[PDB]
Scaffold this motif. Structure first.
Motif, PDB file in Angstrom:
ATOM      1  N   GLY A  22      -6.435  -4.906  11.865  1.00 51.36           N
ATOM      2  CA  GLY A  22      -5.267  -4.037  11.847  1.00 51.36           C
ATOM      3  C   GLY A  22      -5.546  -2.728  12.550  1.00 51.36           C
ATOM      4  N   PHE A  23      -6.638  -2.089  12.154  1.00 54.21           N
ATOM      5  CA  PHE A  23      -7.210  -0.922  12.824  1.00 54.21           C
ATOM      6  C   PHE A  23      -8.610  -1.294  13.282  1.00 54.21           C
ATOM      7  N   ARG A  24      -8.955  -0.971  14.523  1.00 53.77           N
ATOM      8  CA  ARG A  24     -10.247  -1.373  15.048  1.00 53.77           C
ATOM      9  C   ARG A  24     -10.993  -0.198  15.656  1.00 53.77           C
ATOM     10  N   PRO A  43      -7.168   1.616  18.850  1.00 56.29           N
ATOM     11  CA  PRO A  43      -7.415   1.964  17.437  1.00 56.29           C
ATOM     12  C   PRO A  43      -6.434   1.330  16.482  1.00 56.29           C
ATOM     13  N   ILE A  44      -5.137   1.393  16.791  1.00 58.60           N
ATOM     14  CA  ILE A  44      -4.136   0.674  16.027  1.00 58.60           C
ATOM     15  C   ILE A  44      -3.957  -0.652  16.755  1.00 58.60           C
ATOM     16  N   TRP A  45      -4.582  -1.679  16.211  1.00 60.86           N
ATOM     17  CA  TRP A  45      -4.769  -2.938  16.905  1.00 60.86           C
ATOM     18  C   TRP A  45      -3.669  -3.925  16.558  1.00 60.86           C
ATOM     19  N   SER A  46      -3.347  -4.020  15.285  1.00 58.81           N
ATOM     20  CA  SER A  46      -2.254  -4.855  14.822  1.00 58.81           C
ATOM     21  C   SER A  46      -1.811  -4.376  13.441  1.00 58.81           C
ATOM     22  N   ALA A  47      -1.244  -3.187  13.359  1.00 57.51           N
ATOM     23  CA  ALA A  47      -0.882  -2.631  12.063  1.00 57.51           C
ATOM     24  C   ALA A  47       0.614  -2.494  11.846  1.00 57.51           C
ATOM     25  N   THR A  48       1.442  -2.662  12.872  1.00 57.26           N
ATOM     26  CA  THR A  48       2.870  -2.506  12.708  1.00 57.26           C
ATOM     27  C   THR A  48       3.585  -3.777  13.137  1.00 57.26           C
ATOM     28  N   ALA A  49       4.879  -3.779  12.848  1.00 57.15           N
ATOM     29  CA  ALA A  49       5.676  -4.984  12.921  1.00 57.15           C
ATOM     30  C   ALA A  49       7.132  -4.609  13.124  1.00 57.15           C
ATOM     31  N   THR A  69       0.822  -1.206   0.000  1.00 59.26           N
ATOM     32  CA  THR A  69       0.000   0.000   0.000  1.00 59.26           C
ATOM     33  C   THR A  69       0.861   1.263   0.000  1.00 59.26           C
ATOM     34  N   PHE A  70       1.884   1.321   0.861  1.00 59.81           N
ATOM     35  CA  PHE A  70       2.613   2.568   1.105  1.00 59.81           C
ATOM     36  C   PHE A  70       3.944   2.689   0.376  1.00 59.81           C
ATOM     37  N   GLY A  71       4.596   1.583   0.038  1.00 55.19           N
ATOM     38  CA  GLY A  71       5.894   1.687  -0.607  1.00 55.19           C
ATOM     39  C   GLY A  71       6.973   2.155   0.360  1.00 55.19           C
ATOM     40  N   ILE A 100       7.490   5.964   7.082  1.00 54.47           N
ATOM     41  CA  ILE A 100       8.199   6.184   8.340  1.00 54.47           C
ATOM     42  C   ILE A 100       8.112   4.949   9.228  1.00 54.47           C
ATOM     43  N   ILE A 101       7.009   4.193   9.131  1.00 54.54           N
ATOM     44  CA  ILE A 101       6.815   3.011   9.958  1.00 54.54           C
ATOM     45  C   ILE A 101       7.674   1.825   9.539  1.00 54.54           C
ATOM     46  N   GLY A 102       8.272   1.856   8.361  1.00 50.79           N
ATOM     47  CA  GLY A 102       8.947   0.679   7.843  1.00 50.79           C
ATOM     48  C   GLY A 102      10.422   0.866   7.588  1.00 50.79           C
ATOM     49  N   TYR A 139       1.017   9.463   3.071  1.00 54.19           N
ATOM     50  CA  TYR A 139       0.002   8.415   3.052  1.00 54.19           C
ATOM     51  C   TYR A 139      -0.201   7.806   4.435  1.00 54.19           C
ATOM     52  N   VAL A 140       0.892   7.572   5.163  1.00 49.79           N
ATOM     53  CA  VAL A 140       0.777   7.055   6.520  1.00 49.79           C
ATOM     54  C   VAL A 140      -0.076   7.989   7.365  1.00 49.79           C
ATOM     55  N   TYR A 141       0.118   9.304   7.218  1.00 44.81           N
ATOM     56  CA  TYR A 141      -0.734  10.240   7.949  1.00 44.81           C
ATOM     57  C   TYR A 141      -2.183  10.143   7.501  1.00 44.81           C
ATOM     58  N   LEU A 142      -2.411  10.046   6.194  1.00 46.91           N
ATOM     59  CA  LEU A 142      -3.775  10.048   5.687  1.00 46.91           C
ATOM     60  C   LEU A 142      -4.519   8.760   6.005  1.00 46.91           C
ATOM     61  N   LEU A 143      -3.839   7.757   6.553  1.00 55.29           N
ATOM     62  CA  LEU A 143      -4.518   6.620   7.157  1.00 55.29           C
ATOM     63  C   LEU A 143      -4.618   6.873   8.662  1.00 55.29           C
ATOM     64  N   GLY A 144      -3.580   6.504   9.416  1.00 55.44           N
ATOM     65  CA  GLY A 144      -3.722   6.428  10.866  1.00 55.44           C
ATOM     66  C   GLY A 144      -3.845   7.761  11.585  1.00 55.44           C
ATOM     67  N   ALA A 145      -3.091   8.771  11.173  1.00 54.85           N
ATOM     68  CA  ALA A 145      -3.215  10.041  11.876  1.00 54.85           C
ATOM     69  C   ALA A 145      -4.610  10.626  11.694  1.00 54.85           C
ATOM     70  N   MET A 146      -5.199  10.445  10.501  1.00 55.79           N
ATOM     71  CA  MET A 146      -6.563  10.894  10.231  1.00 55.79           C
ATOM     72  C   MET A 146      -7.606  10.042  10.952  1.00 55.79           C
TER      73      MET A 146
HETATM   74  C1  LIG Z   1       0.129   7.463  11.990  1.00 61.96           C
HETATM   75  O1  LIG Z   1      -0.425   6.526  11.075  1.00 61.96           O
HETATM   76  C2  LIG Z   1      -0.086   5.192  11.201  1.00 61.96           C
HETATM   77  C3  LIG Z   1       0.511   4.609  12.341  1.00 61.96           C
HETATM   78  C4  LIG Z   1       0.810   3.241  12.334  1.00 61.96           C
HETATM   79  C5  LIG Z   1       0.528   2.447  11.227  1.00 61.96           C
HETATM   80  C6  LIG Z   1      -0.035   3.070  10.086  1.00 61.96           C
HETATM   81  C7  LIG Z   1      -0.383   2.356   8.793  1.00 61.96           C
HETATM   82  O2  LIG Z   1      -0.023   0.995   8.908  1.00 61.96           O
HETATM   83  C8  LIG Z   1      -0.345   4.406  10.102  1.00 61.96           C
HETATM   84  O3  LIG Z   1      -0.908   5.029   8.980  1.00 61.96           O
END
Ligand SMILES: COc1cccc(CO)c1O
Ligand code: HEM
Length: 403
Positions: A390-392, A287-293, A70-72, A76-78, A236-243
């Motif tokens: 992943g997000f709940r 909210p971020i339930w299992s989205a990072t690794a 999705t993000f390429g 910042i998370i990867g 893009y990371v912001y436009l998912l989780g930060a939003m």
């Molecule tokens: C701040 O936003 C995020 C935080 C952690 C994971 C993701 C996407 O996997 C996000 O977009």
């Protein structure tokens, strides 16, 4: 391959999205670090293992498979090392507590009031769509420089990016089972580019106080800007989780308070308890339930499992926040739980960068809601469904009040 966990072969993605807590209750007891076949990855389910992996010098960040699709790069998370340090230095200025305290009230409170005045005299509302999500996206959108992008569009984008980045299911051969599920992520990115590329064009020549303008210019030599391809994945990371997440966190907190009516009354009567209510909300449904690794960088032993180098581990913080080694009856929302540490913001060098900002957005939004509608009640004719692995968060929250 682990014989006593053969039942995990029958766990489906739909089951995890609908309600992951039953499976994860078994994992926390049977195998705090376990390979989940439909996810194609080891998963950490307990507080101890999540915290160990997130902070270990033998692990570094890795993006989930569907998150990478999705993000390429460089999300910042990867990323790690020098790129991660640069991206952290890029995003951190507007998130510094002393900076947030200068302007957060004048940002969020008028936004909250604007959305409230559309429905506060109706006697009914669906608070996820009418309040929690709009306030969350309008607040961050204005901070970023996306004032011209309507809240409806920001909400659509984070929904598509959510579904794409959590499109994790793999088949018998480890291949993505639903490759067409990435299409709406690609479409959102294409729309985002069409809107944001002209804004970047302008900010390069005419910097302003928007956060993305500062991402382009801060720390750069004279006349230079960060390349837009270098910053887009973090946009893009912001436009998912930060939003998405502050809205989810506010909504889950409200659902929890509605489940404990005496506690709702206490918080409405005493709004200084809102921060405590939110902290319990984030533990109760993260909210971020299992989205990072993270990925191991050398052979390591975690929870009795010998992992080779190069092994990814998903951090299911939402499960860790129901760890019964730490909490009593964690599936119950309880405002009066002692304020113990929680993992809803992660841990380690890749821990959430926006905690202080997020907590204020949620606080101000709930303060204004309870001031405007002190007799708020849940509409018990409607069910509250939570969705997401992943997000709940809750998919709707119908409320009623006497007008
Ligand atoms: C701040 O936003 C995020 C935080 C952690 C994971 C993701 C996407 O996997 C996000 O977009
Ligand atoms: C209630 C709201 C939020 C919650 C629950 C939340 C939670 C998290 C979590 C769990 C992570 C992953 C940490 C890890 O892997 O250990 C994360 C990362 C991050 N979050 Fe937050 N977040 C929230 C809101 C925000 C907001 C509003 C912003 C920006 C304004 C933000 C910025 C970031 C950034 C930049 C990262 C990546 C950190 C890195 O990888 O170095 N978050 N967040």
């Amino acid at each position: 391959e682990r014989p006593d966990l053969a039942w995990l072969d029958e766990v489906t993605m739909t089951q995890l999205e609908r309600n992951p807590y039953e499976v994860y209750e078994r994992l926390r007891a049977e195998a705090p670090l376990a390979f989940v076949p439909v996810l194609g990855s080891y998963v950490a389910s307990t507080a101890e293992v999540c915290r160990e992996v997130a902070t270990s010098p033998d692990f570094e960040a890795v993006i989930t498979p569907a998150g990478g699709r999705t993000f390429g790069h460089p999300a910042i998370i990867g990323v790690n090392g020098d790129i991660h340090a640069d991206l952290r230095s890029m995003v951190e200025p507007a998130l510094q507590p002393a900076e947030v305290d200068r302007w957060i009230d004048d940002l969020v409170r008028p936004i909250a009031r604007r959305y409230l005045e559309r429905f506060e005299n109706d006697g009914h509302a669906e608070l996820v769509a009418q309040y929690c999500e709009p306030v969350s996206v309008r607040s961050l959108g204005d901070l970023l420089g996306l004032q011209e992008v309507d809240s409806d569009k920001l909400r659509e984008w984070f929904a598509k990016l959510n579904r794409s980045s959590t499109n994790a299911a793999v088949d018998e051969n480890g291949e993505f089972a639903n490759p067409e599920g990435f299409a709406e992520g690609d479409q959102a990115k294409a729309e985002i580019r069409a809107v944001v590329d002209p804004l970047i064009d302008k900010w390069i020549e005419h910097p302003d106080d928007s956060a993305i303008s500062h991402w382009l210019h801060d720390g750069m030599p004279p006349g230079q800007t960060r390349d837009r391809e270098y910053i887009y994945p973090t946009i893009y990371v912001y436009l998912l989780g930060a939003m998405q997440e502050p809205g989810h966190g506010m909504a889950s907190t409200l659902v929890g308070l509605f489940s404990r009516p005496e506690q709702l009354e206490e918080v409405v009567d005493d709004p200084t308890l809102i921060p405590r209510a939110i902290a319990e909300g984030l533990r109760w449904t993260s909210p971020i339930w299992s989205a990072t690794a993270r990925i191991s960088t050398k052979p390591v032993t975690i929870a009795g499992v010998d992992l080779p180098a190069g092994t990814p581990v998903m951090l299911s913080y939402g499960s860790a926040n129901h760890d019964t080694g730490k909490y009593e009856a964690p599936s119950q929302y309880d405002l009066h739980r002692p304020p113990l540490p929680h993992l809803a913001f992660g841990a380690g060098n890749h821990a959430c960068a926006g905690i202080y900002f997020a907590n204020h957005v949620m606080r101000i939004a709930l303060e204004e809601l309870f001031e405007a509608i002190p007799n708020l009640e849940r509409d018990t004719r409607e069910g509250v469904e939570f969705w997401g692995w992943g997000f709940r968060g809750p998919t709707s929250l119908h409320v009623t009040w006497e007008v």
